[PDB]
Ligand binder design. Structure first.
Ligand SMILES: Cc1cc2nc3c(=O)[nH]c(=O)nc-3n(C[C@H](O)[C@H](O)[C@H](O)COP(=O)(O)O)c2cc1C
Ligand SMILES: Cc1cc2nc3c(=O)[nH]c(=O)nc-3n(C[C@H](O)[C@H](O)[C@H](O)COP(=O)(O)O)c2cc1C
Lengths: 368, 352
């Protein structure tokens, strides 16, 4: 069986990169490699990281007297800082309290929880941690329309206030850890098993992964947007034409992502794709950005480049490994404090001022 | 005295350029040159026009089955099409029904009327033409703090839903009064131009934004840093304009300045764009480049000269119909689709 860490404690987060190596000491090797790894030789995961050096922050004089305020609003919900939790499968690979632990951290901090369809936790377990906090539900597009009806009803029943339609799947990702390590999940998918039980699709992990279309179309977006009764974010957008087609099909948001470099290999770093998408979106729908956010400076650069919020992923799971909900809360607190420092140095009093930053174009890239 | 046109009639508007030469035949020479003219030898007015050829529209396949809809909303106000009326002084130079005529056209069509600081009509005359329709009030920054508090109180009591703070006052190689400014410039000789600051500062924007009780647009922005400073000072909107090339000479065409401003604004406040809009394609290009709406100026006044409120209405109708055709050819079903257009960069400019 699977020996996840179970300790609950606050952690002194000085930077999020060191959390990866610290988590590698407490997370079983197979689970750790599932979380940390990425496609191919991880060049596009490194590109996610290095892309932040392509656009650099300028320190700027202040024009306002007040203390910085990190709060913002998305879909009418006020959140403590311009970051949400990304949808991540199987939080139990990092900690025994699993998605309930992360939900407690996110709800206590004051932002939005994204629930993966591949949660290892029941919604009842997650609800305990959420304690009324806002939540969005991430889904894959099922080949069988009934399964889409089923998960949209599950999301409405669970008080979701948005759907995140992930554009890519059947556990994709040429060379993270399943072709190499030969590691398979130690637990189930109770959210989808609720509705797949007694169908062929529920019989195995392969059948669950295989129940999804491998890539969505604009027609798929239109069907989910028409029947969800909720705003739909399309997640995995890296090209501006796709953003335009998704909005025309009825998307209520664009979630710019390469899923933490877990799918297509030898693709751009996600941040390099953001400005072209934001210019084409041109204010029509909110933008969520993710894939590689590690520092407060990254949150600021994403806002300056057209994101309304960013989503956080691996660093929150590494925090959860190291301290359960308190460890995940420490990571959210780190980002909020670091963002406040960046606001002070850029002369920004609020999140709107961050959206107005001028960035320095660095044509030399990472080695400068 | 000044013999302005008085006929009220609809007009067949095939293009707005021909309205200028048609209006030149009915408007007294002095009044016409006041309206049509611009700074220096009019190079920057021509730049305003030629800038539209810098970014070209693509015809595109449709992705929706519905007929085009031009409706939009700004500051919660639903309007028929993504254009509003620009604040223009002294409509009585163009037609005897003056700002009341323009207000009737704008209210009958279904958009927002901007009332100039230097209106020749009383608020009561304009109010009758508006018949309840939405209006924004344009002001200059007074040197006297109490004059600013008084015009802001008057605007809000007259049902204004936004203030337009024009950043510049008056350039090139007035036979009736101003009842609205003279309605608080009696007692001391400011109504006898020297009453207003020639250029505003961020501190001025902050003073107006803090005392208006209404969203303030700052009008005349052409540089992105000024947009950022204005928003930080409490502006609720940016109005990208060179006032129809009537102020600074040997400056860029207004449309060429819009993308840099829109990228810096980055959705923080709505953008109004003006200076040179003459065709539906221009409305589409401004929206694709970050404007929420455009403002129309000279073409509506030429329509007023030719037909009073019905002539001005004819021009608004032309822009709406022309925009609908552009939407069909760009594969756009609605105004949000226009905001998503890709434009072709033309590095050759006008002569191609
Ligand atoms: C372990 C793991 C599992 C993930 N599972 C999902 C998933 O179930 N649904 C999904 O939409 N994205 C999934 N993602 C992608 C995340 O939502 C997010 O895009 C990514 O973590 C961002 O990259 P970063 O964590 O490196 O910053 C997963 C990512 C990780 C690391
Ligand atoms: C005759 C005339 C008078 C104007 N008076 C004012 C004014 O009182 N207040 C103001 O903010 N702008 C004023 N403007 C500028 C207009 O608001 C607007 O920016 C300009 O008409 C747009 O250029 P266009 O008409 O060539 O497209 C005036 C413009 C014209 C042509």
């Amino acid at each position: 069986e699977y020996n996840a860490p179970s300790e609950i404690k606050y952690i002194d987060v000085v930077n999020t990169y060191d959390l990866e190596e610290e988590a590698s000491k407490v997370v079983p090797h197979g689970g750790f490699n599932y979380i940390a790894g990425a496609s191919g030789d991880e060049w596009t995961k490194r590109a996610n990281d290095r892309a932040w050096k392509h656009k650099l922050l300028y320190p700027r004089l202040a024009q306002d007297v007040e203390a910085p305020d990190t709060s913002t609003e998305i879909l009418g919900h006020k959140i403590k800082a311009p970051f949400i939790m990304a949808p991540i499968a199987a939080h139990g690979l990092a900690h025994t309290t699993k998605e309930a632990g992360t939900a407690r951290a996110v709800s206590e901090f004051g932002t939005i929880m994204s629930i993966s369809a591949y949660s290892g936790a029941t919604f009842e377990e997650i609800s305990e941690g959420l304690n009324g906090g806002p939540r969005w539900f991430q889904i894959y597009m099922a080949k069988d329309d009934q399964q889409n009806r089923d998960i949209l009803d599950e999301a409405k029943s669970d008080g979701a206030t948005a759907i995140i339609l992930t554009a890519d799947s059947t556990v994709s990702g040429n060379r993270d850890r399943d072709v190499k390590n030969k590691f398979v999940y130690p637990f189930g998918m109770p959210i989808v098993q609720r509705y797949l039980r007694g169908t062929a699709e529920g019989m195995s992990l392969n059948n669950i992964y295989g129940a999804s279309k491998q890539k969505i179309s604009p027609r798929d977006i239109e069907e989910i947007a028409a029947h969800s009764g909720l705003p739909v974010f399309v997640k995995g957008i890296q090209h501006p034409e796709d953003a335009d087609m998704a909005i025309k099909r009825g998307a209520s948001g664009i979630w710019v992502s390469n899923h933490g470099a877990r799918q297509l290999y030898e693709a751009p770093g996600s941040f390099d794709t953001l400005p072209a998408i934001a210019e084409r979106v041109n204010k029509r729908v909110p933008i969520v950005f993710d894939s590689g956010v590690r520092r407060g400076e990254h949150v600021a650069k994403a806002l300056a480049s057209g994101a309304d919020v960013v989503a956080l992923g691996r660093p929150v799971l590494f925090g959860l490994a190291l301290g359960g909900w308190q460890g995940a809360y420490s990571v959210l607190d780190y980002f909020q404090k670091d963002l406040t420092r960046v606001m002070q140095l850029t002369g920004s009093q609020n999140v709107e001022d961050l959206k107005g930053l001028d960035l320095f174009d660095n044509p030399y890239g990472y080695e400068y």
